[PDB]
């Protein structure tokens with residue numbers, strides 16, 4: 001809940017390295033999500049029934065979404081010091097996924113999980129225990145605001 005100025009800097013600085021290899025990382029994340037937590041695949045018409053990473057990484061639909069996810073995060077990171085703006089971003093997100101896509105909010109949580117897991121595996125020389133703790137705080141914030149919108153919207 002309390003995010004510090006140093007942590008904020010930890011995040012901006014690590015993210016700059018992650019964004020440099022943005023695309024592969026996006027999909028590495030989504031492939032772990034969809035493989036490890038398969039029911040999460042249910043919302044995606046073109047690969048809901050695909051189990052294999054090599055199959056999944058070739059899905060045009062997977063990849064576009066993986067791209068959208070990362071741009072999302074990037075926006076959230078560019079915007080860390082402006083809290084009204086993170087609020088609207090999470091609002092927009094949460095609405096769409098609630099109303100248009102009908103995604104169970106649990107998957108946002110599980111995704112936050114996977115992002116750490118993959119960040120601090122693909123980019124371990126940067127994601128130190130300390131940096132990981134900051135990303136934790138951030139992603140709990142993301143997930144918390146998403147849930148808040150989901151309730152505003154009528155999901156209980």
Ligand code: HEM
Pocket residue numbers: 040041043044045061065068069070072073093096097100101103107108111
């Ligand atoms: C930080 C997390 C995420 C971000 C930034 C994100 C962003 C987006 C964006 C920008 C779109 C397209 C624009 C829109 O329709 O609103 C989209 C579509 C979608 N998202 Fe996400 N999303 C995220 C997480 C999730 C998660 C966890 C799921 C879980 C299954 C999911 C499922 C979908 C689906 C089903 C669509 C429709 C895409 C399609 O037509 O194939 N998203 N997302």
